[PDB]
Amino acid sequence: SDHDLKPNAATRDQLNIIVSYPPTKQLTYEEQDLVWKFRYYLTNQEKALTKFLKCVNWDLPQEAKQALELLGKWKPMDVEDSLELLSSHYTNPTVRRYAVARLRQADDEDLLMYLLQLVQALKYENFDDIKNGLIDSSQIITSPLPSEQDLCTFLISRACKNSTLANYLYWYVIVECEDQDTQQRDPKTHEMYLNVMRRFSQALLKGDKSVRVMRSLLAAQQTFVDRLVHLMKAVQRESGNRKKKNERLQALLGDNEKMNLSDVELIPLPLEPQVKIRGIIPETATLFKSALMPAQLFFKTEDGGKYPVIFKHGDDLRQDQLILQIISLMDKLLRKENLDLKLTPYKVLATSTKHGFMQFIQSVPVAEVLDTEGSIQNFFRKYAPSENGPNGISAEVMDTYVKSCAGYCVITYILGVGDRHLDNLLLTKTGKLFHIDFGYILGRDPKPLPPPMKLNKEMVEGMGGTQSEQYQEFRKQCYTAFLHLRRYSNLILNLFSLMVDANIPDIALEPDKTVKKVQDKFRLDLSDEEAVHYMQSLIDESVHALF
C-alpha cells in the first residue's frame, strides 16, 4: 500500500522536475497526484515539502489529518522555504505554526533581513487569535498602564530579546496602524495591526528590566518623531522664501525648552537604532530646494560624531523603503558568495505613511559632476589622482567604480527600476556609484517602451570606454552577479509573494502580476551558460543604442 511505494527511474525524473519548480508555479492535478502518491518516499527530501503541502486536498478530513502526520515526520525544510507557508495561500493553522517553528531556528540577523515582509504576513494570520492574546496607535507605547507560537507571538517574543528587531517591529507596525487606505478599505486589517501593537506593548511591560527599558526608549523615539513632525509643519505653514524657512527651522531647533529636539537621553535613531543620538544640531539644518522641501538634519551621536539624515514630510516612503531593504538583502547574499560589489544600501525608514527618514550619503549627483568637472573620469582625477593608475585614477577607486556600476546594473534590471537620469545616479569620491529615488519600479516608467538595461554613456566613459580593460571586468561582474542572485530566486520570490497586498503603488497597480515581473527577470527558463549570454546581450544592446 501507499507507504511502501518506491518510484522507478522515470518517475524520479518527473518528481525532481516538480520539486525544482519555483515557489510560485501552480502545480497541475497530475503533478499533485504524483507528489501525493509518492509522499512517503519524498519525506526524505526537505525541498519536496512545500510541493507536498500544495498537493493535499484539505477539504477531505482524511488527507488533511494524514498530511499533518507526514508534515511532522518530514525532514525539516530550510528557513528560506518556510516563508512560502506564510503567504495568503495557506490558512491551515498547523501549517502556519510549522512555518513559524522553522523561523525560530533562524539567527536574529537573517530574521532582520526578512522582517518587513514578515510584518506584511500578519495580514494572513488569524485575527481572532491575535485579539484573544490580549485607541490612537502612536499613543500605545507612550501610555503604559501602571504597576505553539503563531507569527504574532513569535515576532513579539524575538523582539523582547533583541532591541534592533524590536525597533523595526515597532516602526513597521506603527506605519500599518497609521495607513489610512487600510482604515478606509480594510477595517479588519487595521484593527489587527492595532491589536498587534497592543500585544507588543503588553509583552514589553510584562517583562524583566531589560525589556521594560526597551519599551521606554521606543516611547522616547515616538515622541521625538512627533515633536519633529510638529516642527516641520510649523516651518511649512510659514510663507516666505527658502532662506526665511531655514531661519525658522534653525530657531525652533535651537529652542530646546519648547521643542526638546537638541538634547535627548542617548535614544536610538529610528532609522538606524545602533546609532544613539544626543539631539539635532540646530545651526546646520537646512531645507532642500524641491517641491516638498524636506530637511537635511545632522544628529549629534554619543561619540560626538554627526550622522546626517533627510527627513521628508508629506510623502510616502514605503516603496523606497522596500527597494532599499531588498538591495540590502541582495548585497548580503552576494557578500555571502564572496562578492562585495561596493553597493550603497542606505537606510530608509517610514515613520508614518506621510513622513520618514533617509540616510544622507556624502556624494555628488552625476549631473553635477558633468556640470562642474565634465566627466566621471575628470572627477576621479581631481579627487583621487594616481600617477600609475588606470587613466591617472587610483586603482582602488576604479575597482570600486567598476564593481558598483555592475552591481547596480544587474540590481536595477531585476527590480525593473525606471525614471533613471543623471540626478538620481550618485557618485562618491571613493568610486562608489549608486541609485536613489525609486518611485518607478517593476517595469513602470514615465516614458513609453523603456530600455530593460539602465546603462548610460557617461557610465561607460567613466570606465574608460568600450575598449578598456575596466569594461571587460564590468561585463564579467555583471554576469557573475546575475548567476548568484538567480541561485537565491526562491527566497527573493518568496519575499515578494509576501508583499502582494502591501499598499506600495507599483505593486498595488497589478498585485497578481507582481511576482512574475520579478521572476521573468531571472530568466529561470535559461541555463547558467545561456543566462550569461542573455546578460551580455542586454549590455551590448544598450551600449550600441548609446553610441
CA angle at residue 280 from 276 to 284, to 5 degrees? 135
Shortest distance, CB of residue 297 to Cl ion, whole angstroms? 10
361 interface partner picked from Cl ion, ligand AJZ, none, CB below 5 to 8 A per type? ligand AJZ
Shortest distance, CB of residue 288 to Cl ion, whole angstroms? 5
Shortest distance, CB of residue 329 to ligand AJZ, whole angstroms? 16
150 interface partner picked from Cl ion, ligand AJZ, none, CB below 5 to 8 A per type? none
Among 11, 24, 45, 92, binds Cl ion (CB under 5 A): 92
Judge whether 380 and 369 are in contact, CB under 8 Å.
Answer: no
Q: Which is nearer to ligand AJZ, 64 or 361 (CB)?
A: 361
Shortest distance, CB of residue 294 to ligand AJZ, whole angstroms? 8
Q: Which residues contact 329 (CB under 8 A, 6 or more apart)?
A: 113, 492, 495
Rounded Cα–Cα distance for residues 480 and 156 (Å): 39
Q: Which is nearer to ligand AJZ, 228 or 358 (CB)?
A: 358
436 interface partner picked from ligand AJZ, Cl ion, none, CB below 5 to 8 A per type? ligand AJZ
Q: Does 162 bind Cl ion (CB under 5 A)?
A: no
Q: Which is nearer to Cl ion, 10 or 291 (CB)?
A: 291
The helix or strand, by DSSP H or E, that contains position 173, with its residue range, turns out to be helix 163-178
**Contact code string over 42-81 relative to Cl ion, x by CB under 5 A:** ----------------x-----------------------
Q: Which is nearer to ligand AJZ, 92 or 328 (CB)?
A: 328
Q: Which residues contact 527 (CB under 8 A, 6 or more apart)?
A: none
Q: Which is nearer to ligand AJZ, 343 or 426 (CB)?
A: 426
290 secondary structure, DSSP code: S
Shortest distance, CB of residue 98 to Cl ion, whole angstroms? 11
Contacts with ligand AJZ, residue ranges (CB under 6 A): 310, 320, 346, 358, 360-361, 363, 426, 436-438
Rounded Cα–Cα distance for residues 43 and 69 (Å): 11
Length, in residues, of the chain = 547
92 interface partner picked from Cl ion, ligand AJZ, none, CB below 5 to 8 A per type? Cl ion
Retrieve residue 205's grid coordinates: 511591560
Rounded Cα–Cα distance for residues 95 and 49 (Å): 11
320 interface partner picked from Cl ion, ligand AJZ, none, CB below 5 to 8 A per type? ligand AJZ
183 interface partner picked from Cl ion, ligand AJZ, none, CB below 5 to 8 A per type? none
Q: Which is nearer to ligand AJZ, 23 or 431 (CB)?
A: 431
Q: Which residues contact 132 (CB under 8 A, 6 or more apart)?
A: none
Q: Which is nearer to ligand AJZ, 430 or 536 (CB)?
A: 430
261 interface partner picked from Cl ion, ligand AJZ, none, CB below 5 to 8 A per type? none
- Positive or negative torsion for Cα 92, 94, 95, 99: positive
Shortest distance, CB of residue 6 to ligand AJZ, whole angstroms? 55
Please report, as residue ranges, which positions from 292 to 331 form the binding site for Cl ion (by CB under 5 A). 296
Shortest distance, CB of residue 360 to ligand AJZ, whole angstroms? 5
Retrieve residue 57's grid coordinates: 486536498
Q: Which is nearer to ligand AJZ, 427 or 543 (CB)?
A: 427
Q: Which is nearer to ligand AJZ, 324 or 531 (CB)?
A: 324
How far is C-alpha 439 from the geometric centre of its chain's CA atoms?
15
Number of Cβ atoms within 10 Å of the Cβ of 73 = 8
175 interface partner picked from Cl ion, ligand AJZ, none, CB below 5 to 8 A per type? none
Q: Which is nearer to ligand AJZ, 437 or 458 (CB)?
A: 437
Shortest distance, CB of residue 308 to ligand AJZ, whole angstroms? 8
**Contact code string over 269-288 relative to Cl ion, x by CB under 5 A:** -----------------x--
358 interface partner picked from Cl ion, ligand AJZ, none, CB below 5 to 8 A per type? ligand AJZ
35 interface partner picked from Cl ion, ligand AJZ, none, CB below 5 to 8 A per type? none
- Positive or negative torsion for Cα 541, 542, 543, 545: positive
Residues in binding contact with Cl ion, number by CB under 5 A:
6
Buried b vs exposed e over 355-367: b needs ≥16 C-beta within 10 Å? bbbbbeeebbbbe
SS3 for 262?
coil
Retrieve residue 81's grid coordinates: 522555504
> Segment near Cl ion (CB under 5 A), from 40-48, 84-92, 98-106, 108-116?
84-92
287 secondary structure, DSSP code: E
User: Which residue number places its CB atom closest to Cl ion?
Assistant: 92
Rounded Cα–Cα distance for residues 426 and 532 (Å): 27
Shortest distance, CB of residue 59 to Cl ion, whole angstroms? 10
CA angle at residue 274 from 268 to 280, to 5 degrees? 45
Residue type, 419: D
137 secondary structure, DSSP code: G
Q: Which is nearer to Cl ion, 92 or 163 (CB)?
A: 92
Q: Which is nearer to ligand AJZ, 165 or 369 (CB)?
A: 369
Shortest distance, CB of residue 250 to ligand AJZ, whole angstroms? 20
Shortest distance, CB of residue 359 to ligand AJZ, whole angstroms? 6
User: Which residue number places its CB atom closest to ligand AJZ?
Assistant: 361
Retrieve residue 546's grid coordinates: 548609446
Shortest distance, CB of residue 541 to ligand AJZ, whole angstroms? 28
Residue type, 37: K
DSSP per-residue letters across 293-331: --EEEEEEETTS-EEEEEEEESS--HHHHHHHHHHHHHH
Shortest distance, CB of residue 247 to ligand AJZ, whole angstroms? 21
Rounded Cα–Cα distance for residues 84 and 51 (Å): 11
395-414 and 469-487 are packed helices; what angle lies between their axes, rounded to 10 degrees? 40
Pairing of strands 295-301, 272-280: antiparallel
Judge whether 180 and 190 are in contact, CB under 8 Å.
Answer: no
Residue type, 154: F
> Which residues contact Cl ion (rule: CB under 5 A)?
58, 90-92, 286, 296
